[PDB]
Design an enzyme around this catalytic site. Structure first.
Site, PDB file in Angstrom:
ATOM      1  N   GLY A  58      50.241  55.936  31.188  1.00 47.33           N
ATOM      2  CA  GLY A  58      50.156  55.568  29.785  1.00 47.33           C
ATOM      3  C   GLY A  58      48.828  54.913  29.450  1.00 47.33           C
ATOM      4  CD  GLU A 124      50.712  36.523  21.949  1.00 50.27           C
ATOM      5  OE1 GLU A 124      50.154  35.797  21.057  1.00 50.27           O
ATOM      6  OE2 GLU A 124      50.960  36.167  23.178  1.00 50.27           O
ATOM      7  CE1 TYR A 125      42.545  43.589  21.313  1.00 45.99           C
ATOM      8  CE2 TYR A 125      41.894  42.560  19.243  1.00 45.99           C
ATOM      9  CZ  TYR A 125      41.570  43.271  20.394  1.00 45.99           C
ATOM     10  OH  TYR A 125      40.276  43.647  20.666  1.00 45.99           O
ATOM     11  N   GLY A 128      39.553  38.363  23.531  1.00 43.95           N
ATOM     12  CA  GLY A 128      38.515  38.025  24.490  1.00 43.95           C
ATOM     13  C   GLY A 128      38.424  38.961  25.686  1.00 43.95           C
ATOM     14  N   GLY A 129      39.386  39.879  25.870  1.00 43.76           N
ATOM     15  CA  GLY A 129      39.305  40.815  26.989  1.00 43.76           C
ATOM     16  C   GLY A 129      39.550  40.109  28.307  1.00 43.76           C
ATOM     17  CG  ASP A 169      49.491  43.128  39.208  1.00 44.13           C
ATOM     18  OD1 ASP A 169      48.584  43.465  39.958  1.00 44.13           O
ATOM     19  OD2 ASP A 169      49.886  43.879  38.265  1.00 44.13           O
ATOM     20  CE  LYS A 171      44.486  43.816  39.749  1.00 45.86           C
ATOM     21  NZ  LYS A 171      44.412  45.126  40.480  1.00 45.86           N
ATOM     22  CG  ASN A 174      46.157  42.437  36.537  1.00 46.62           C
ATOM     23  OD1 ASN A 174      46.873  42.588  37.547  1.00 46.62           O
ATOM     24  ND2 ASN A 174      45.509  43.443  35.981  1.00 46.62           N
ATOM     25  CG  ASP A 187      48.856  43.861  33.636  1.00 52.14           C
ATOM     26  OD1 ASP A 187      48.975  44.014  32.392  1.00 52.14           O
ATOM     27  OD2 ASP A 187      47.843  44.134  34.323  1.00 52.14           O
ATOM     28  CB  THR A 204      44.651  43.982  44.153  1.00 50.25           C
ATOM     29  OG1 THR A 204      45.283  44.531  42.993  1.00 50.25           O
ATOM     30  CG2 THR A 204      43.206  44.382  44.146  1.00 50.25           C
TER      31      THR A 204
HETATM   32  N1  LIG Z   1      45.277  42.482  24.132  1.00 50.35           N
HETATM   33  C1  LIG Z   1      45.847  42.971  24.975  1.00 50.35           C
HETATM   34  C2  LIG Z   1      46.502  43.614  26.078  1.00 50.35           C
HETATM   35  C3  LIG Z   1      45.750  44.420  26.926  1.00 50.35           C
HETATM   36  C4  LIG Z   1      46.321  44.992  28.062  1.00 50.35           C
HETATM   37  C5  LIG Z   1      45.502  45.792  29.004  1.00 50.35           C
HETATM   38  C6  LIG Z   1      44.175  46.113  28.721  1.00 50.35           C
HETATM   39  C7  LIG Z   1      43.410  46.818  29.638  1.00 50.35           C
HETATM   40  C8  LIG Z   1      43.972  47.240  30.830  1.00 50.35           C
HETATM   41  C9  LIG Z   1      45.304  46.967  31.115  1.00 50.35           C
HETATM   42  C10 LIG Z   1      46.017  47.561  32.304  1.00 50.35           C
HETATM   43  C11 LIG Z   1      46.828  46.540  33.078  1.00 50.35           C
HETATM   44  N2  LIG Z   1      45.989  45.415  33.501  1.00 50.35           N
HETATM   45  C12 LIG Z   1      44.715  45.930  34.012  1.00 50.35           C
HETATM   46  C13 LIG Z   1      44.842  47.391  34.351  1.00 50.35           C
HETATM   47  O1  LIG Z   1      45.046  48.175  33.162  1.00 50.35           O
HETATM   48  C14 LIG Z   1      46.047  46.214  30.218  1.00 50.35           C
HETATM   49  C15 LIG Z   1      47.681  44.777  28.291  1.00 50.35           C
HETATM   50  C16 LIG Z   1      48.444  44.007  27.430  1.00 50.35           C
HETATM   51  C17 LIG Z   1      47.879  43.391  26.309  1.00 50.35           C
HETATM   52  N3  LIG Z   1      48.639  42.589  25.462  1.00 50.35           N
END
Ligand SMILES: N#Cc1cc(-c2cccc([C@@H]3CNCCO3)c2)ccc1N
Lengths: 352, 18
Positions: A58, A124-125, A128-129, A169, A171, A174, A187, A204
């Site tokens: 996904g 939630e969004y 900041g990444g 998980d 790291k 995440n 995650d 990992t």
């Molecule tokens: N904002 C927000 C938000 C972003 C992610 C997300 C963004 C990039 C990658 C990933 C996945 C899972 N962890 C790293 C590996 O690829 C998740 C998941 C939930 C969120 N609520």
């Protein structure tokens, strides 16, 4: 002794208050765990904006709720692909955990729903990444900056472990940074309810505890090992155990040897030696005094745990604020979201 | 140096789970 009467009474009172908080939090978790929320929005409530991450089953997209204008991160999972890759139980469990937990550093599931083709988790969004990008850009975090993040993980694991959840998980990839500079954990695909031991090889390489590598049954102490790896990598800029290939990483992890940069404080090295302890009878977080051996360590002496929980501490770093800015996430090719006229895998996903 | 060894490992990017 190390504490006079006033300090010892204050510490004892604080530790008893944690027990009281956790007992109430467990009660609340168990109610939601036994009666999960389902079907709280639908796809046409949202406009799709952009992909924030992609994976084998996904993707996560920035979306906008049409009526409120609020932005969210929507994880989209293709039911047929989840079945094909043997991820049914992990997918159902992740959603069940997310809808049941409640803590300021755990991402909130605002809506979830499914249709003929897909499962949707609207979270939630967090603009900041990932911590990962900031860490690689800045190089390393100063000890106070690393400590601010570490304290949030300590409290989050204290909460999760009280619910008998192992995380598995941890790291920088995440951990997301919010607009106030605080961490968000998102995650839960490897998390498991475990009161005793479990056996799955997952995680990992750099972050795996020795007992996982050695194919032992293991417990929540693997999360405290992982915390040690995280603190080390935040403060050094690189993790304690690395090599070109995972097998060489694993040899280092099990060896009982770790080396530190010359700029690490003695307090930090002492904490890390107690977290990155191969011998489970000696590892902090796994002793009679539990989480308190970590929280009462000298490296955390300046940490006001309640102020961190209440989000009243000024963060050391605020990501650049550009509310639907995606600048702190990577760019990905935009593929369409197709919904079939026929329901797929209905029986497998009844509980979602 | 340790930092140079980290660069040489090829594991400076995002790491996948096992
Ligand atoms: N904002 C927000 C938000 C972003 C992610 C997300 C963004 C990039 C990658 C990933 C996945 C899972 N962890 C790293 C590996 O690829 C998740 C998941 C939930 C969120 N609520």
């Amino acid at each position: 002794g190390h504490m006079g009467n006033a300090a010892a009474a204050k510490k004892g009172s604080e530790q008893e208050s944690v027990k009281e908080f956790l007992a109430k939090a467990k009660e609340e978790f168990l109610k939601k765990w036994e009666s999960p929320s389902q079907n709280t929005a639908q796809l046409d409530h949202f406009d799709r904006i952009k992909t924030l991450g992609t994976g084998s089953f996904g993707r996560v997209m920035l979306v906008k709720h049409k009526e409120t204008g609020n932005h969210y991160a929507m994880k989209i999972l293709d039911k047929q692909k989840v079945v094909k890759l043997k991820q049914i139980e992990h997918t159902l469990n992740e959603k069940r955990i997310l809808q049941a937990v409640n803590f300021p550093f755990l991402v909130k599931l605002e809506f979830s729903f499914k249709d003929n083709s897909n499962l949707y988790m609207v979270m939630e969004y967090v603009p900041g990444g990932e911590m990962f990008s900031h860490l690689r850009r800045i190089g390393r975090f100063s000890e106070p900056h690393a400590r601010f993040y570490a304290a949030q993980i300590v409290l989050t694991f204290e909460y999760l472990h009280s619910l008998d959840l192992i995380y598995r998980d941890l790291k920088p990839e995440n951990l997301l940074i919010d607009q106030q500079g605080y961490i968000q954990v998102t995650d839960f695909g490897f998390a498991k309810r475990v009161k005793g031991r479990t056996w799955t090889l997952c995680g990992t390489p750099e972050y795996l505890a020795p007992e996982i590598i050695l194919s032992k049954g293991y417990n929540k102490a693997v999360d405290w090992w992982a915390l040690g790896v995280l603190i080390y990598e935040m403060a050094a800029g690189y993790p304690p155990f690395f090599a070109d290939q995972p097998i060489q990483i694993y040899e280092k992890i099990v060896s009982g040897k770790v080396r530190f940069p010359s700029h690490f404080s003695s307090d930090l090295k002492d904490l890390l030696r107690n977290l990155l302890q191969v011998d489970l009878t000696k590892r902090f977080g796994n002793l009679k005094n539990g989480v308190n051996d970590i929280k009462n360590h000298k490296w955390f002496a300046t940490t006001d745990w309640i102020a961190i929980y209440q989000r009243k501490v000024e963060a050391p770093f605020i990501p650049k604020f550009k509310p639907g800015d995606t600048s702190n996430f990577d760019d990905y090719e935009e593929e369409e979201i197709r919904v079939s006229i026929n329901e797929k895998c209905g029986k497998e996903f009844t509980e979602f | 140096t340790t930092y140079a060894d980290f660069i040489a490992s090829g594991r400076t990017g995002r790491r996948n789970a096992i």
